[PDB]
Amino acid sequence: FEDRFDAREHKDRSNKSRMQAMEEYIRESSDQPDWSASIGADIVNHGRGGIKSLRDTEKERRVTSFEEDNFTRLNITNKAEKRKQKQRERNARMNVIGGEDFGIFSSKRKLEDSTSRRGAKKTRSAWDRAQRRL
Amino acid sequence: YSTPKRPYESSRLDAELKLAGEFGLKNKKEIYRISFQLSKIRRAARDLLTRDEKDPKRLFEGNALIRRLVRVGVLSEDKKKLDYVLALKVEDFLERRLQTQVYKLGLAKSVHHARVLITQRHIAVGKQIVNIPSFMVRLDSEKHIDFAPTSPFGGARPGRVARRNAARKAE
Amino acid sequence: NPKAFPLADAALTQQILDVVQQAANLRQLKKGANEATKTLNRGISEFIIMAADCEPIEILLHLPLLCEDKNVPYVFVPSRVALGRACGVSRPVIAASITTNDASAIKTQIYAVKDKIETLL
Amino acid sequence: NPADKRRRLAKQYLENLKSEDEYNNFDAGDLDKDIIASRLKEDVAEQQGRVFRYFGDKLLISEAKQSFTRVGENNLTCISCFQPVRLFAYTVSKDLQLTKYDITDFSKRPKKLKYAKGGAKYIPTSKHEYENTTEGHYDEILTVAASPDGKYVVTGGRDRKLIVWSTESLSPVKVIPTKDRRGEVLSLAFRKNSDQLYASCADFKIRTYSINQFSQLEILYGHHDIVEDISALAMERCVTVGARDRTAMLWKIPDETRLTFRGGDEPQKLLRRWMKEPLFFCEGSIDVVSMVDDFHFITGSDNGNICLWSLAKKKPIFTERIAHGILPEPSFNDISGETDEELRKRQLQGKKLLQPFWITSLYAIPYSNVFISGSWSGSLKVWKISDNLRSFELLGELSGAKGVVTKIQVVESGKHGKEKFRILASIAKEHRLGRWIANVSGARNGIYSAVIDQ
Amino acid sequence: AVTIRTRKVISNPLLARKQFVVDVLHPNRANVSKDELREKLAEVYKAEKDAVSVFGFRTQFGGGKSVGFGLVYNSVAEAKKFEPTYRLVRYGLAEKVEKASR
Amino acid sequence: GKRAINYQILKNKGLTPKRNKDNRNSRVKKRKKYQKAQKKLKSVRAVYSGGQSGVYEGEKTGIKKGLTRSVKFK
Amino acid sequence: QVLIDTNFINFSIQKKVDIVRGMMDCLLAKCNPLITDCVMAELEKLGPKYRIALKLARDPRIKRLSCSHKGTYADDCLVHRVLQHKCYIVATNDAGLKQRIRKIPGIPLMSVGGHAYVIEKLPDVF
RNA sequence: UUGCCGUUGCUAUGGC
Ligand SMILES: [Zn+2]
């Protein structure tokens, strides 16, 4: 028929398939270092919270970058904080043990269904798989 | 956390007696919390064993699980197999907390001296003073547990009892 | 067979020297030959490290007979200088001993090194 | 094949993450950040400076004027130098003395100017770790560091103090203790063209200071053994190496984060690599560093390795296994105590207890193509790094320095295409931390200066 | 002794201004001591003490560091023009109260 | 002139039994019922105390030549 | 390591639980199941009605001990070899053997209950 | 050219 401008198909998603087991294997076989903190600087409330998870320190780094980048403190916006801070810290003390989150091992989500087993390079021909190898 | 199945059998009572006495715990909730999340950990590793070799779930979640267990420190570097996650147990998890570790490193004379040092803030891993006893130190924070520099057992100015006794003996 | 027989190769030597350094920090190491034989006849010792290149060799070969008597593992590191540097003192040592402790934060590492040098021996 | 399936599934994973060169290739956020980059100030300190002094094969090597000025101080320990943009040098010893030199009289040996000797008089009257505010050293000064501007020298050692002396008079202007019991300092480095000092203290700690404000900036934690060496350039990065944990870390000090680099050479795979057709083995302790530029550095190990590391690879780029030789084996008249040479030879076990020299000094000239290594093999070695920055290679040797080389650094002279340098190297007969060193083979406690040309 | 570190210094000619982030370092002190910090900032940069300003102070846990947002003006008059009135009430000279009714 | 209230009307702990200082802390109670337990364990088993302390003085408590405390099979 | 007996095997097959997989998801640990020769003698003496149970006890994953006594009384053999050593879990469903085993101390007891195995005197199950 | 001490050079070395 006709085209219709779809930001949901030229928007960077990159999160439906971001699995922590694959990302951990990539960090293992990365062959370039990882920017870890000086060891005491990443625990949070004198140990009343966790250490902090890798996603939490990534998000903290993003927030401080945006913070310094346009000179604005973030706030105590009530609905978003009563959702995200309390639910986040309660699943943090549920699943984050010693700076490592073990929540994923208790979660049904198929690895190979979404994040592996390529869909575009599906190679549904003997000739296409032969040319993809050679 | 969650309570066990038969919470009052005599083996469980002598178990909790030995655990709380050997690790200086305050009540049953420490054992029950760390055993609940250990139950989740090795209930997951059981399923990772019940699936087969060269399964994607088994390969990636297995080496992920044993590497973050090694980095928590309950599993040593050489046993990189997934049946040691099943051999893991509860005192392997609560030997990693900061009270146990302060006593084992010898900054305290017992686990109770370690608990009161931690709650009186004389102990800092790395940069920050940790002040709760159940902290689960990691394999990289294992060697920077030392006395806080803000504390008289470090090198700081002595506390109120020492300075008041010094002042009254100067009077 | 030389006199200083159960020598370790380089990987086992560095594993031994790393746990020696950690025990020296944790006050679980008695260093020197006569302190080692003192703690050996007292029975508080988990394994003894002799260095296989000091200026006599029988000077510490007296210790394998004691270890054999009391069933304690003994292993020969090929550098007294590196052994003293691992011990953390400003001199070479020729023998050192890991004392037994159960309020010890490196018990798993000491047991792993004991198993390695006992399968060597 | 499970690792093949791991690599394959990781490749498919990265392809899928890409899923979720044309004539127009411009990205709005990148060009907006580049507009902010055009707007900002301070393109001064944060040069990611690459290797811009390519002169390794250029200058002469074999005919340096080598003067070994012996001094009467037991076991010299460090060397600090200075150039403005007359040149002074500094030495310090285990006899608790700092000594100022003039070095600018380039064609001859250096000139003594001023002593500053601590002793038993400076032991504090408290034995209490925060009133360590005396004015002299009472134990084992290990390191000196001259300011990049030259107002001060700052020194410290096993008395867990930092004493900052003025240059013109060698007087203690300020004392800063390290406030704890094990706080012995082991290495000091100013960041270049600055007033900021990076000290590496044996608490697995790195302290930072501003010297002209007499203030401490930041304490940063994270090594696992004692931080045996430190190195810095004009950037606010730093590179430290702890001894036995066999890792070298580099620190973004404002961010207080680090990049770790472990070693990882194994004689099993290495002897198999030779077995495809040999006395080389694993690693003891990474000991010394020098940051060559803002993307690479070089580490000196305990088994004689010199390794070259990038900022973008965990494992090292290049190794050099034996860099100063293997030590002379202990004699048959000093191993056994039997009578016959056959049993005294059987007590050497062949080649099993030959230990290599360990590189106890390493100095990369900043941003240059050439670094200098030193141990008690008697001969300093000079190596140049290849222009593709993936290897180095031995140019020549400097064989007039009998003893342990506790410090190497160079002093520049000459213009952009014609240059001459004097390599200072502190020579002792004893390692700069403990004794441990037997077979003192004709050593003397001196300053080995060499004048290299072209 | 407090210690000062400026980072990411950009220039705003539209607001006649130079702005940056301020790592303030006070080992064994309480906190930033903002007027003394404006003094130290006005002497590390040029004079303009009623034209230097800081607003966004966050001290990290355990003390020592605090990140603030520093903006320094030339021309104290145009600093008075461009700064907001609550910060002028906080630091400088302006004081206009709101009419209290209903 | 202010007739202040006192502790028994304030806290209202009406007619309690005498209770335990060790019960006032949940941690010290388990410290002192584990010390009691591992003093009772010396009675039932024979506990490895740590080996020979000094010179071997003797058995210090007696040797029974009639008792055999060993587990027979089936 | 878990000592099995005959009614535990019969109830396992009647409830459709695998032996080693039922043990593994009961204890969340790696189990070694042991058939003594007297339990095997009892399963063989049960006749040709119990062929399915006998050739499910014949399983290479189920290791097997060698009892050295006369007669095939598995309850006596299990009780003796567990009160000798205290390194054994006893998996059983006999009421009398369950009472014997839970009267001797320090011995965990496993039993088919419902549609999976249950364990009682093992104080670290979660 | 130094803590002593030796060869010293009319500057280099080597024993503690
Ligand atoms: Zn039997």
Side-chain angles (χ1 to χ4, degrees):
Chain A
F1 209 97
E2 208 58 42
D3 60 337
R4 183 55 247 171
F5 192 60
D6 208 317
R8 312 195 197 89
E9 79 187 8
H10 59 276
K11 170 66 72 64
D12 173 64
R13 253 80 173 270
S14 158
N15 296 331
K16 301 284 102 176
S17 42
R18 194 74 70 100
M19 293 215 190
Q20 305 200 28
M22 299 308 294
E23 285 311 308
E24 188 267 349
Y25 176 62
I26 287 157
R27 295 303 184 274
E28 173 187 350
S29 316
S30 161
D31 205 341
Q32 45 165 335
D34 283 296
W35 287 118
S36 62
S38 89
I39 71 145
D42 61 315
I43 85 166
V44 281
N45 203 0
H46 306 289
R48 170 66 185 272
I51 311 294
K52 57 180 46 178
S53 160
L54 206 44
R55 46 160 317 275
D56 295 294
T57 181
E58 270 163 311
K59 190 191 62 182
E60 183 71 28
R61 173 194 312 189
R62 265 190 296 195
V63 170
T64 68
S65 176
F66 172 81
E67 182 88 2
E68 65 85 19
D69 190 46
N70 60 6
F71 276 79
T72 41
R73 301 274 151 218
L74 297 200
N75 320 299
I76 195 173
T77 78
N78 195 313
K79 302 194 45 57
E81 72 92 16
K82 197 214 174 299
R83 286 182 292 279
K84 89 200 162 302
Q85 305 290 97
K86 275 86 195 177
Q87 185 135 320
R88 170 172 283 105
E89 294 297 324
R90 80 185 62 171
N91 59 68
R93 89 174 179 272
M94 276 155 186
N95 306 94
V96 176
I97 295 97
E100 305 292 328
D101 51 350
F102 287 86
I104 58 179
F105 309 99
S106 89
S107 169
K108 72 97 182 183
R109 182 179 150 184
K110 286 185 295 160
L111 188 81
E112 82 299 337
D113 178 32
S114 305
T115 209
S116 292
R117 299 303 288 180
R118 68 274 172 272
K121 285 193 247 202
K122 189 67 168 53
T123 67
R124 43 171 191 270
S125 153
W127 188 61
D128 297 329
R129 73 187 71 191
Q131 295 281 61
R132 272 296 304 134
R133 201 182 87 123
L134 288 73
Chain B
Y1 82 111
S2 283
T3 43
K5 297 291 187 300
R6 324 189 57 190
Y8 285 132
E9 61 167 20
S10 299
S11 64
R12 188 160 285 276
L13 301 180
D14 292 306
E16 296 161 358
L17 174 61
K18 187 177 178 64
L19 288 176
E22 191 180 359
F23 295 89
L25 314 178
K26 196 185 56 202
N27 51 7
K28 299 180 301 189
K29 282 185 72 173
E30 277 102 7
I31 305 105
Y32 288 172
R33 204 178 300 121
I34 197 62
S35 68
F36 168 69
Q37 55 193 354
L38 160 71
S39 90
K40 282 195 290 180
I41 283 174
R42 64 179 182 177
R43 184 183 307 249
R46 191 263 176 281
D47 303 336
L48 261 66
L49 264 301
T50 203
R51 64 183 65 250
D52 46 317
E53 204 66 60
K54 320 300 193 198
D55 207 70
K57 180 74 70 70
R58 178 167 182 177
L59 297 149
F60 292 115
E61 297 219 329
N63 86 318
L65 176 57
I66 63 184
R67 276 184 85 262
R68 60 199 44 191
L69 270 194
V70 160
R71 291 195 275 111
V72 167
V74 304
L75 198 47
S76 93
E77 270 97 327
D78 58 353
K79 32 184 73 179
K80 288 296 186 54
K81 294 210 256 198
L82 207 52
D83 54 357
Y84 292 97
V85 191
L86 306 172
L88 211 63
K89 62 174 70 175
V90 54
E91 64 265 17
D92 298 328
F93 262 91
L94 44 78
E95 278 178 353
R96 294 307 301 168
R97 44 190 271 155
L98 185 56
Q99 162 172 5
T100 307
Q101 287 297 100
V102 160
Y103 162 62
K104 292 271 201 52
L105 294 171
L107 313 182
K109 268 165 282 298
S110 51
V111 289
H112 302 274
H113 188 202
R115 181 141 190 154
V116 307
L117 279 172
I118 289 169
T119 58
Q120 286 165 359
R121 303 172 181 181
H122 305 281
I123 296 296
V125 313
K127 193 185 68 170
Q128 296 252 310
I129 287 178
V130 199
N131 83 310
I132 83 153
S134 70
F135 182 58
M136 308 282 150
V137 313
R138 317 153 84 253
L139 210 63
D140 54 354
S141 316
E142 193 182 0
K143 288 202 60 180
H144 311 77
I145 312 165
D146 207 11
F147 279 116
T150 324
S151 71
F153 307 135
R157 192 266 311 271
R160 49 166 164 168
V161 166
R163 72 167 160 249
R164 175 186 51 202
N165 293 12
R168 285 203 256 105
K169 288 174 66 178
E171 192 265 319
Chain C
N1 45 308
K3 285 170 171 166
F5 161 69
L7 190 86
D9 43 356
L12 189 59
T13 302
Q14 284 319 117
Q15 213 165 336
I16 281 166
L17 257 55
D18 283 9
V19 310
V20 157
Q21 190 205 62
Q22 270 143 353
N25 292 15
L26 290 180
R27 278 88 177 151
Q28 219 167 329
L29 177 87
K30 283 207 162 304
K31 58 190 79 67
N34 78 329
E35 277 203 54
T37 193
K38 270 189 265 178
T39 198
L40 199 51
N41 56 71
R42 287 163 171 184
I44 43 168
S45 58
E46 279 173 348
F47 59 102
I48 301 187
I49 299 105
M50 286 87 62
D53 58 83
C54 50
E55 269 154 329
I57 197 51
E58 301 96 24
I59 180 183
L60 50 80
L61 202 158
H62 89 95
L63 293 153
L65 168 64
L66 280 199
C67 284
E68 280 195 331
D69 195 317
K70 283 154 195 66
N71 268 340
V72 179
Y74 63 106
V75 63
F76 276 91
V77 166
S79 163
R80 58 188 149 110
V81 177
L83 189 52
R85 189 139 146 85
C87 284
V89 299
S90 317
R91 280 308 296 221
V93 313
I94 71 167
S97 196
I98 309 283
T99 48
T100 84
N101 198 14
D102 307 299
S104 86
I106 49 167
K107 193 196 299 179
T108 61
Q109 324 189 4
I110 295 172
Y111 282 175
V113 182
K114 254 194 69 169
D115 299 359
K116 293 201 77 178
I117 72 184
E118 203 208 323
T119 66
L120 173 70
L121 177 72
Chain D
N1 210 327
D4 300 4
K5 191 166 169 171
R6 274 168 181 138
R7 271 150 195 204
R8 189 254 286 182
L9 283 171
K11 208 157 293 163
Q12 298 184 358
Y13 171 76
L14 291 171
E15 283 164 20
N16 269 101
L17 288 185
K18 290 193 317 210
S19 279
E20 303 206 353
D21 313 348
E22 212 184 25
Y23 159 71
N24 47 348
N25 53 2
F26 49 95
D27 168 81
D30 214 317
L31 54 87
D32 289 355
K33 187 183 56 55
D34 268 347
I35 290 317
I36 309 300
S38 161
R39 204 157 79 187
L40 53 85
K41 186 220 204 298
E42 179 80 330
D43 44 0
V44 173
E46 46 266 58
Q47 276 76 247
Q48 299 267 43
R50 291 205 170 275
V51 192
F52 82 105
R53 212 183 269 118
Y54 277 161
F55 74 112
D57 46 3
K58 191 253 156 186
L59 79 163
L60 299 165
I61 180 66
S62 49
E63 56 270 15
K65 294 164 287 291
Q66 312 154 349
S67 44
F68 176 60
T69 169
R70 39 197 269 164
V71 68
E73 286 289 306
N74 262 313
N75 317 130
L76 289 180
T77 308
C78 198
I79 273 292
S80 199
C81 310
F82 173 61
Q83 292 97 8
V85 191
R86 39 165 83 98
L87 324 170
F88 313 118
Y90 298 93
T91 201
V92 78
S93 87
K94 296 204 189 184
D95 299 354
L96 279 298
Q97 194 184 278
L98 169 63
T99 311
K100 184 173 181 179
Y101 294 150
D102 206 40
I103 198 188
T104 187
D105 201 354
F106 209 87
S107 158
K108 56 174 287 300
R109 87 210 182 276
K111 280 304 286 291
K112 176 166 303 200
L113 267 75
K114 269 168 300 179
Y115 81 110
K117 181 185 195 75
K121 315 294 291 175
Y122 287 123
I123 286 183
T125 172
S126 86
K127 181 60 96 191
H128 201 43
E129 269 294 339
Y130 83 114
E131 41 192 350
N132 203 16
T133 60
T134 179
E135 303 94 25
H137 287 73
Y138 50 93
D139 200 354
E140 193 41 51
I141 326 173
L142 294 180
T143 39
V144 283
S147 300
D149 65 276
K151 276 185 304 191
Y152 307 100
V153 76
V154 184
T155 193
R158 298 204 166 170
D159 47 326
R160 68 209 61 91
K161 277 201 307 300
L162 268 303
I163 299 287
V164 45
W165 311 72
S166 74
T167 289
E168 74 272 13
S169 46
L170 258 64
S171 71
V173 195
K174 185 61 166 56
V175 46
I176 298 179
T178 52
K179 304 177 310 300
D180 71 328
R181 196 198 66 248
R182 321 161 306 167
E184 313 153 68
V185 285
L186 275 76
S187 294
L188 266 74
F190 280 91
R191 57 180 298 265
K192 303 306 164 58
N193 294 116
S194 76
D195 40 354
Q196 296 193 356
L197 172 65
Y198 302 154
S200 70
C201 322
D203 319 340
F204 326 108
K205 276 179 195 44
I206 312 293
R207 301 183 154 82
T208 55
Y209 301 92
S210 69
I211 304 308
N212 53 4
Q213 264 289 94
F214 299 135
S215 44
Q216 41 169 343
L217 275 289
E218 283 168 352
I219 174 63
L220 63 159
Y221 306 83
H223 262 285
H224 167 279
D225 206 26
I226 66 178
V227 278
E228 195 165 85
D229 198 29
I230 205 164
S231 159
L233 294 187
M235 202 168 240
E236 218 163 4
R237 269 154 176 77
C238 169
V239 173
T240 71
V241 50
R244 208 162 261 273
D245 46 353
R246 303 179 290 273
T247 179
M249 293 157 179
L250 72 95
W251 309 88
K252 262 185 80 186
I253 290 174
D255 194 19
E256 288 180 347
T257 42
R258 87 186 95 96
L259 304 170
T260 191
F261 302 90
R262 309 205 176 273
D265 48 355
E266 292 88 5
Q268 273 317 97
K269 73 182 198 71
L270 262 42
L271 269 297
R272 191 254 164 273
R273 170 67 53 87
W274 197 88
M275 181 142 286
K276 84 187 168 313
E277 292 190 7
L279 195 76
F280 50 92
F281 55 88
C282 76
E283 208 278 331
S285 156
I286 314 286
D287 283 0
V288 282
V289 281
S290 276
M291 202 197 298
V292 46
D293 56 324
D294 275 24
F295 288 90
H296 287 59
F297 55 88
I298 43 171
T299 51
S301 163
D302 216 345
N303 47 341
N305 294 124
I306 309 183
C307 290
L308 162 77
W309 310 74
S310 51
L311 257 284
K313 283 194 166 305
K314 312 174 185 298
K315 285 191 153 298
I317 277 187
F318 188 50
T319 182
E320 170 79 5
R321 308 299 310 281
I322 285 289
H324 287 264
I326 316 174
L327 276 146
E329 51 92 23
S331 62
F332 308 108
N333 299 322
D334 277 331
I335 176 65
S336 163
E338 293 266 334
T339 56
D340 69 302
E341 193 43 83
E342 201 269 348
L343 288 188
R344 300 177 309 206
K345 273 189 207 318
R346 203 152 145 93
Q347 293 324 297
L348 263 294
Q349 297 164 287
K351 317 181 69 184
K352 298 194 179 307
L353 54 91
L354 322 168
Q355 298 294 307
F357 292 82
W358 63 68
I359 167 172
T360 175
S361 294
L362 174 134
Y363 187 78
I365 310 169
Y367 314 103
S368 90
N369 222 27
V370 52
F371 56 93
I372 302 105
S373 72
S375 71
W376 62 99
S377 199
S379 48
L380 273 74
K381 306 219 169 178
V382 158
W383 319 71
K384 79 167 172 66
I385 178 166
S386 81
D387 280 350
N388 75 317
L389 296 167
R390 261 83 56 102
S391 290
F392 57 88
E393 192 35 74
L394 198 155
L395 292 180
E397 308 199 11
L398 262 60
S399 298
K402 294 297 295 310
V404 290
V405 194
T406 81
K407 199 59 165 172
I408 304 175
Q409 55 195 20
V410 308
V411 163
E412 283 214 300
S413 158
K415 303 292 281 196
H416 301 72
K418 280 296 294 170
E419 56 264 0
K420 45 183 308 179
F421 317 95
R422 57 187 321 191
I423 305 177
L424 294 193
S426 177
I427 307 302
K429 55 180 65 163
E430 168 180 328
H431 196 278
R432 64 166 283 250
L433 299 168
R435 287 179 158 266
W436 309 309
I437 295 303
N439 199 33
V440 184
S441 298
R444 303 276 321 173
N445 297 155
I447 293 95
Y448 171 78
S449 176
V451 194
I452 204 74
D453 219 340
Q454 167 164 344
Chain E
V2 80
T3 321
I4 184 72
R5 184 170 64 218
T6 187
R7 289 180 317 155
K8 281 158 305 203
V9 181
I10 73 165
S11 44
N12 205 339
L14 275 78
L15 285 154
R17 202 174 72 180
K18 187 179 283 186
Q19 52 194 358
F20 53 92
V21 69
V22 198
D23 304 347
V24 188
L25 285 82
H26 40 274
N28 69 20
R29 291 194 74 231
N31 51 6
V32 286
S33 301
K34 146 190 293 171
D35 302 338
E36 291 86 357
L37 188 44
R38 256 154 167 143
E39 299 302 344
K40 180 154 286 308
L41 215 45
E43 62 200 305
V44 61
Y45 279 137
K46 307 326 298 190
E48 53 255 21
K49 198 256 157 181
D50 205 358
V52 58
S53 174
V54 290
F55 47 88
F57 280 129
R58 285 310 190 275
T59 307
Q60 49 190 37
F61 274 70
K65 288 191 67 188
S66 312
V67 157
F69 286 145
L71 78 174
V72 59
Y73 291 86
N74 49 357
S75 175
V76 180
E78 85 196 341
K80 281 164 41 63
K81 168 212 200 308
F82 278 140
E83 283 276 352
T85 179
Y86 64 92
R87 202 165 320 134
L88 287 158
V89 162
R90 278 184 212 175
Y91 163 66
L93 56 96
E95 181 67 28
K96 167 174 175 178
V97 307
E98 203 92 5
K99 171 182 148 216
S101 159
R102 296 281 196 171
Chain F
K2 200 73 74 71
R3 286 214 299 132
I5 203 169
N6 59 341
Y7 194 85
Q8 72 151 341
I9 316 177
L10 174 62
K11 297 291 290 178
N12 204 49
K13 311 197 183 83
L15 273 195
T16 47
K18 165 182 181 169
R19 274 146 182 189
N20 213 7
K21 170 89 159 299
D22 317 280
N23 257 316
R24 291 172 70 92
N25 203 342
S26 160
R27 177 184 49 88
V28 188
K29 179 67 146 36
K30 295 158 181 40
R31 162 165 163 84
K32 297 171 87 65
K33 70 190 290 291
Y34 174 67
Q35 283 176 22
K36 276 194 56 180
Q38 74 173 13
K39 278 170 194 186
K40 295 192 219 279
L41 190 64
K42 292 221 302 165
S43 280
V44 280
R45 290 170 35 211
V47 174
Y48 171 73
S49 290
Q52 176 185 323
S53 55
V55 193
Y56 177 60
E57 293 180 352
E59 264 305 291
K60 276 172 55 197
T61 193
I63 291 172
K64 300 209 163 211
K65 80 178 193 194
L67 195 66
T68 82
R69 299 197 59 100
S70 72
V71 179
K72 316 276 201 38
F73 286 83
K74 64 213 155 295
Chain G
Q1 46 195 15
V2 181
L3 298 154
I4 313 171
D5 65 334
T6 77
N7 43 15
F8 188 83
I9 280 187
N10 298 339
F11 274 128
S12 279
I13 298 153
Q14 197 260 325
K15 295 304 200 324
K16 286 194 192 41
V17 190
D18 205 70
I19 308 293
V20 311
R21 292 208 280 255
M23 276 164 186
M24 275 206 58
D25 68 346
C26 169
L27 297 185
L28 312 162
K30 168 172 290 308
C31 281
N32 312 329
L34 304 171
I35 287 290
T36 43
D37 293 343
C38 57
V39 159
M40 204 64 172
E42 196 168 330
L43 275 168
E44 283 165 19
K45 278 193 233 161
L46 280 168
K49 298 216 195 70
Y50 285 76
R51 298 176 68 186
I52 300 100
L54 182 62
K55 72 179 299 303
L56 288 178
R58 285 178 207 277
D59 185 14
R61 288 181 306 181
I62 296 179
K63 295 290 155 283
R64 49 182 308 156
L65 289 167
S66 299
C67 59
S68 297
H69 50 85
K70 290 189 211 289
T72 78
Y73 195 31
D75 309 348
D76 261 342
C77 187
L78 258 61
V79 160
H80 290 171
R81 82 164 60 235
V82 79
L83 70 92
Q84 179 71 32
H85 277 112
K86 312 267 183 324
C87 64
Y88 284 119
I89 307 189
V90 174
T92 178
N93 280 315
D94 220 342
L97 194 64
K98 266 161 98 188
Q99 291 290 336
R100 286 182 90 170
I101 293 296
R102 82 178 64 160
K103 278 207 298 185
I104 54 183
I107 299 307
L109 182 135
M110 178 193 275
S111 84
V112 194
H115 44 266
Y117 298 159
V118 312
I119 179 77
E120 47 161 25
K121 282 161 72 208
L122 181 54
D124 44 272
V125 301
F126 89 119

